[PDB]
Amino acid sequence: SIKCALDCDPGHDDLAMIMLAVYSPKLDVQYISTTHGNQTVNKTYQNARRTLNLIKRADKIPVYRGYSKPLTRESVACPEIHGESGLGGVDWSEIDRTMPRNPALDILGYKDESELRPDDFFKHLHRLVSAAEDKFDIISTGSETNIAQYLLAYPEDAKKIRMTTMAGNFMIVGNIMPFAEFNVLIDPEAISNILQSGVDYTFAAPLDITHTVLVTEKVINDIKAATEPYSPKFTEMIIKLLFFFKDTYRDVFGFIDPPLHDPVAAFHLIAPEWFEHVRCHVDIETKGEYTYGCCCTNLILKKKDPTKIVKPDNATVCLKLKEGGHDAFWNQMITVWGEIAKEIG
Amino acid sequence: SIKCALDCDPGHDDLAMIMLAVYSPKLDVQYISTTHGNQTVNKTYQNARRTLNLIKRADKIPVYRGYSKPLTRESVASGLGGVDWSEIDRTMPRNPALDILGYKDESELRPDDFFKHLHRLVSAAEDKFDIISTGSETNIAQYLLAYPEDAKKIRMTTMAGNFMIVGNIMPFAEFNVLIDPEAISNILQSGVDYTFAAPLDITHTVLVTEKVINDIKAATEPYSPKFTEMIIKLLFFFKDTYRDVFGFIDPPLHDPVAAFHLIAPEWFEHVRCHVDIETKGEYTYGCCCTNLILKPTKIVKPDNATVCLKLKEGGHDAFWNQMITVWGEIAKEIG
Amino acid sequence: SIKCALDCDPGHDDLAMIMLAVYSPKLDVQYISTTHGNQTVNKTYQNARRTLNLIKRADKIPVYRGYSKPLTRESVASGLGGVDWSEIDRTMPRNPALDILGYKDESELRPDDFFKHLHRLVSAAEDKFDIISTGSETNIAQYLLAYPEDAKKIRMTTMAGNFMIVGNIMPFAEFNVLIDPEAISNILQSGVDYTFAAPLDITHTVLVTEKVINDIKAATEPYSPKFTEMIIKLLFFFKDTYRDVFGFIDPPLHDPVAAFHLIAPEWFEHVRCHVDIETKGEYTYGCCCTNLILKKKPDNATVCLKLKEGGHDAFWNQMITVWGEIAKEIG
Amino acid sequence: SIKCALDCDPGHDDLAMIMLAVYSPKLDVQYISTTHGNQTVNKTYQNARRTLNLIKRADKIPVYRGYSKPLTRESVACPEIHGESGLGGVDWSEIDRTMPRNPALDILGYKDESELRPDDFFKHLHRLVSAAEDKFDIISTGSETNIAQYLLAYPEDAKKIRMTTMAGNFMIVGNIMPFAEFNVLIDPEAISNILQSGVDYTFAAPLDITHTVLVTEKVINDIKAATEPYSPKFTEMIIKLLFFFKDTYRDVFGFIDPPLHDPVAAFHLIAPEWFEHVRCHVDIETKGEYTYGCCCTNLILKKKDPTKIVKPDNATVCLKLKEGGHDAFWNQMITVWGEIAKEIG
Ligand SMILES: OC[C@H]1O[C@H](O)[C@H](O)[C@@H]1O
Ligand SMILES: OC[C@H]1O[C@H](O)[C@H](O)[C@@H]1O
Ligand SMILES: OC[C@H]1O[C@H](O)[C@H](O)[C@@H]1O
Ligand SMILES: OC[C@H]1O[C@H](O)[C@H](O)[C@@H]1O
Ligand SMILES: [Ca+2]
Ligand SMILES: [Ca+2]
Ligand SMILES: [Ca+2]
Ligand SMILES: [Ca+2]
């Protein structure tokens, strides 16, 4: 079993990722840290805890509320995709009202949530990094501000951190900006810092991959088949969240079926075998006026003139799923949804 | 018939574009102006004249040798490999441009030579004068700096940029834009009526297949086997690198597509939009940035270009029949 | 008395500033936080504690070791040359910060340690809590990123920048700004009440002349000759490079001037203006850009361009009196 | 006698520079080319010709109308200093009405001025560059766009061009922007191009020097003394122009006596021996948002760590006048004003 932490900004797809990571027996989630991105970090905190409560885990997994804005830029949310709440599609009154105390507070010695501070997670992560036999796994699927901040406070830990991310676009264009992907552009300095720090970094789920991991009619019916027998209430919840995500992806980006981005990065930690991988140098544009967040690589230059590479590698890039990859991913995701529905009843 | 000028950096693609434009009865080429690219503007001059001589037109069309480097950056400089050009070079007629300029020979050619000829054409035009541009766009930027009042009477039709797909020589940008993005940025702000007629979006689907090669042979081999051999080699010179570097099974032909746009616009999708050219980006200069991906109350910066993202149905076939018919007529004249 | 904290990168100048702030009865130093500069934040930690120990205060004031590098750029890293510190190091009392934090020893110090202490001070303040900042301003930028709602209740008084004269380590920019301009840019946008109290504009006219040196000796040599010797060497360590590189006959003392501003603001000219920090410039990052040159976007700082008349003398009498009291305590 | 051309944007101080250069026997002016800057290049054309006509030379010196805007930015004029015309202070009706035909037109084969084109000067300059035994001298005291354009058309001539300029600020702050000087900031890409091209370039008159070359009451009375005996009309003209320049320099920048910048660069070609000189690497800021046009040098680094210098020298910088320099300058300037007044009567 692999001990890991999740850094995320839920967000419908982060919701899916938490489910997979928390319930996969291959992963052992230590905590969740929320960031700014799809919404304000206060909402993404609340949304991680809602995800956990729905899956009967809100009193088991500590959740930390992290940094509210990027290193050197202004926050940019994405209600256009994820609603003003960050998890549109459903009424969360019941989940909010039955929310157990956050075990993070116990760890921190806090009476209540008003004491939560962005750097709360630091000491917990540092214990996990120290304890790790090789490297400690972080899955990051929102802005990567929190990890940048950690590394600024703990630079000596970078070499013992392994990042597995949903971020970027390489061989296809971006989404919220022409050539850049949301998670990078909202704080490119963060990812630029991380790449230079000594972290072992994997672009596990760029749009390149995530734009082929779509929530089709076939997926929706497999979900209902795995869940409706055990928990109609849970079916209703997860379907509505996915339909809301679909509708905005259609109205905003023309997509017929929406991409379920973030679980794919958890899937990479669960089962790396399903992914193509290439080592390269990734530069994050920070100076560009219209192109900040662009992930610019030396892949062309290796292919052209291989033995003249100036810059050393600083990342793994996953451009495609290997054969059977899409199937492997959905079976793992739908099995988790089926187990969740069992626990809920 | 449509009077026009060609600005280009031949270049095998540009060679194909000159052929189409010069031999199309729909177009009336007034001159050709060459620019820098992978090859020095001196070579691209020589290559335009080689193209013209091969097609029995070197003594009809004036060719100008333009600027050797970008507005504010460094160049990245035969330029028509695949072929022995000794015969073409040796039988080269005098460049009619020299007569117009009063020059004894070619060593007197200056980058701004084209200016007064273009200004006469712009003045004479009833609406706008058509320029087809398929290399760096430095020359046109320079012209507009010398003649700002003419921008409003210039219509540009270009091979440049990439919009819904990634770039080529840099991750998100296309060669012609990145080699001088300030040029295109200037032009877009100037009042020029500007059409991205042949971005990679379109040109990456205009590929030299087995079917194209045999149609070429069919149109050319009866009349000029030498010319068949030549045009195939030129089209396949960069084939291996296009495969191993950029994944193509069959290599693209970019620049003719922009001449095709002036010949027959009706084969192209078209959308008016605001294009920003990245100039500040370290790794992303030359990017053509639009909101085309997006389907509020946000201040819309006004349109400054037409973007052609795809060929309409039958467009690829319309293009090749026009291109291959030209190659067929050329091969007739050569024998 | 005015409660305040010092953020600094000692540094001979910062050493002088700590002395003034700690021994002035007008100021009540709550803690010192160290930052990166020409020396690593580990050394600047050690140097703040050395300053405190020398002045018989290392067991009174908590010192925090802060961030080791800028927000988004690379560091440019003893830091108090001129002196043998073996005695001071060996007699160093436990850092009271450790007691506050529950740490056994100094290896457990973390850059964000100061945060909760500062937040208590900000909350407790009736209007705003005073920070004097005289190195890179990374620590304060980090704090504000963790605690954005506190910006409105923080008053900064800094040694940083250059406005009507050129810079020092770069043509148009001053060390403290250029080493992390994103930090100061952040702070200026945050809501902090910010004063450029001691730009080069002022500090380049606060020079260690023969007259200053003899006044120092007069105030100190009667009580502590070894302290006289120490403080002169520290003040003249960088003399040769200040002459050969930057033209000064007598070298400047920058950072005390910012503590002096909190002690006695009335000696300074002041103007409210909009300051833009260059971050995009290749050769000009750290430039503090205003329209101050012109006599014909909302204000975000106070700028102090010159000392009022008698200001130089007010400053030295305060500085030299502190050195005289220190020398008394040392003997 | 030294053959040279003037590139300028008159402008009250350019007016003074033309006077000095044209009437100094040490200099042989081949032509004047006007640029954008203190005003639109059409006005600076008219203003060069007005200068020439006033000094009985409008039919002797060809004037070219050059480029109207910078290489890659939008024009910025300076009416705040120089009036909407570019030469406020005086009524120019008489000068305009008695303006002889521009000899440039004869050189170009043009019937009239509507045929003037920005690249007109090119062929004339190229003949002068070819004919020069070493290098051909250009004095440049406005935007340097025209010379950048020339070099883009004629790159092989750069090595045979010597520039002597009024531009920049090095050890003091700028004027129209905090850290940069008008002539550089209005087109920094131009100067950046020129510095990289192979031109032999001298910053002969930065603000460093020009801010100490002031039009005092002592200068004004010396002017009147040298001119009023021979031409009261000319005295009236040159005084009014200087007083207008003074008043705006006071209202705009608080200067009591205004700096007469541009003549100082002509003075450098007349008598270099009055100037300090240092060779260094000058970088022009082009990327800075608030600091474009800044002249950033490696002078600090040679002083600090001398034998590590990376970047090769690309300019001469004149930081101060040598002793007697200010006197030498005014005697030369006031003698010219005195000779002008003689010819006018
Ligand atoms: O571009 C994909 C990222 O932004 C989307 O909003 C998802 O949350 C994902 O993390
Ligand atoms: O980017 C495609 C362009 O570059 C190629 O070299 C062709 O000439 C074409 O104009
Ligand atoms: O540039 C002035 C600053 O740098 C110096 O090194 C001093 O520490 C001062 O705070
Ligand atoms: O900054 C000085 C320059 O601009 C001024 O306006 C002068 O004309 C001079 O050429
Ligand atoms: Ca997410
Ligand atoms: Ca081309
Ligand atoms: Ca300091
Ligand atoms: Ca001028």
Distance D240 CA to ligand 8 centre (A): 18
Please answer yes or no on whether D285 and C284 come within 8 Å at the CB atom. yes
Q: Which residues pair with A180 in a beta bridge?
A: A177
Beta pairing, strands A315-317 & A278-280: antiparallel
Of A117, A153, A189, the CB nearest to C111: A153
Q: Are B67 and B41 in contact (CB under 8 A)?
A: yes
Of D67, D72, D286, the CB nearest to B186: D72
Type and span of the H or E element at C104? none
Amino acid identity, position D17 = M
Distance C139 CA to ligand 7 centre (A): 13
Q: Which residues pair with B29 in a beta bridge?
A: B4
Q: Which of residues 203-262 of D touch C (CB under 8 A)?
A: 251-254
| Burial degree of A193 (CB within 10 A; 0-12, 13-18, 19+) | buried
Place of tokens 């980090």: C142
Q: Are C312 and C306 in contact (CB under 8 A)?
A: no
Hey, which chains touch C, using 3+ CB pairs under 8 Å? Answer: A, D
* DSSP code at position B94: P
Is the C-alpha dihedral spanning C288, C292, C296, C302 positive or negative? positive
* DSSP code at position C173: B
Rounded CA separation B134/B137 (Å): 8
Q: Are C238 and C330 in contact (CB under 8 A)?
A: no
Q: Is D261 in the pocket of ligand 4 (CB under 6 A)?
A: yes
Integer angstrom CA distances of residue B119 from A113, A257, A262, B34:
72, 53, 57, 17
Distance B227 CA to ligand 2 centre (A): 22
Is the C-alpha dihedral spanning B209, B215, B221, B227 positive or negative? negative
C219-243 residues labelled b (16+ CB within 10 A) or e (exposed):
bbeebbeebbebbbebbbbbbeebe
User: SS3 of B272, please?
Assistant: strand
User: SS3 of C23, please?
Assistant: helix
Cβ neighbours of B245 in A, within 8 Å: 300, 303-304
Q: What is the dihedral of CA B312, B313, B316, B321, to 10 degrees?
A: -110
Rounded CA separation C161/C198 (Å): 8
C244 is in an annotated binding site: no
Q: Which of C155, C160, C159 is nearest to C121 (CA)?
A: C155
Residues with Cβ–ion distance below 5 A, ligand 6: B 9, 11, 14, 134-135, 255
Q: Two tokens at D194?
A: 């020129």
Q: Which of D232, D220, D315 is nearest to D260 (CA)?
A: D220
Please answer yes or no on whether A291 and B172 come within 8 Å at the CB atom. yes
Is the C-alpha dihedral spanning B299, B303, B304, B306 positive or negative? positive
Rounded CA separation A320/D20 (Å): 72
Cβ neighbours of D154 in B, within 8 Å: 110
Rounded CA separation C225/C240 (Å): 24
Q: Which of C286, C321, C288, C318 is nearest to C303 (CA)?
A: C288
Type and span of the H or E element at B68? none
| Burial degree of A239 (CB within 10 A; 0-12, 13-18, 19+) | middle
Rounded CA separation D238/D240 (Å): 6
Backbone torsions φ then ψ of D85, nearest 5 degrees: -75, -35
Residue C108, chain A, CB below 8 Å: the answer is no
Q: Is B175 in the pocket of ligand 2 (CB under 6 A)?
A: yes
Q: Two tokens at A280?
A: 């390269």
E strand segments, chain D: 2-8, 27-34, 63-65, 136-140, 161-165, 200-203, 278-280, 282-284, 295-297, 315-317
Rounded CA separation D173/B85 (Å): 59
The residues after which chain D has a C–N gap greater than 2.5 Å are: none
Count of other CB atoms within 10 angstroms of residue B291: 14
Q: Which residues pair with A280 in a beta bridge?
A: A315
Total number of residues shown for chain C: 331
* DSSP code at position A272: G
Beta pairing, strands D161-165 & D136-140: parallel
Say what the resolution is, in angstroms. 2.3
C166-191 residues labelled b (16+ CB within 10 A) or e (exposed):
bbbbbbbbbbbbbbbbbbbbbbbebb
Helical H segments across A26-174, by residue range: 41-54, 79-82, 93-97, 103-108, 121-131, 145-153
Count of other CB atoms within 10 angstroms of residue B211: 11
Rounded CA separation C281/C261 (Å): 31
**What determination technique applies here?**
X-ray
Q: Are B257 and B198 in contact (CB under 8 A)?
A: yes
The contacts of residue B165 (CB under 8 Å, 6+ apart) are A172, A173, B200, B201, B204
Count of other CB atoms within 10 angstroms of residue B293: 17
The contacts of residue C240 (CB under 8 Å, 6+ apart) are none
Catalytic residue chosen out of the listed positions C12, C117, C254, C261: C254
Beta pairing, strands B276-277 & B288-289: antiparallel
Backbone torsions φ then ψ of C178, nearest 5 degrees: -65, -30
Interface test with B, best of A291, A301, A302, A317 (most B CBs within 10 A): A291
Backbone torsions φ then ψ of C32, nearest 5 degrees: -120, 135
Rounded CA separation A173/A185 (Å): 13
End-to-end CA distance of chain D: 27
* DSSP code at position B298: P
Q: Are A151 and A119 in contact (CB under 8 A)?
A: no
Rounded CA separation A262/A38 (Å): 12
Residue D42, chain B, CB below 8 Å: the answer is no
Q: Are A43 and A86 in contact (CB under 8 A)?
A: yes
End-to-end CA distance of chain B: 27
Distance A262 CA to ligand 1 centre (A): 7
Integer angstrom CA distances of residue C247 from A136, C241, D302:
53, 9, 14
Of D68, D152, D189, the CB nearest to B148: D68
Rounded CA separation B14/B37 (Å): 11
Q: What is the dihedral of CA D178, D183, D185, D188, to 10 degrees?
A: -140
Q: Are A235 and A229 in contact (CB under 8 A)?
A: no
Catalytic-residue membership of C254: yes
Integer angstrom CA distances of residue C68 from B161, C34, C41, C94, C173:
43, 9, 5, 22, 21
Rounded CA separation C37/A4 (Å): 35
Please give the residue of chain D at the shortest CA–CA distance from B116. D117
Q: What is the dihedral of CA B96, B101, B105, B106, to 10 degrees?
A: -80
Beta pairing, strands D278-280 & D315-317: antiparallel
If phi > 0 it is left, if psi is from -120 to 50 it is alpha, else beta; for residue A100 that is beta
Residue C280, chain D, CB below 8 Å: the answer is yes
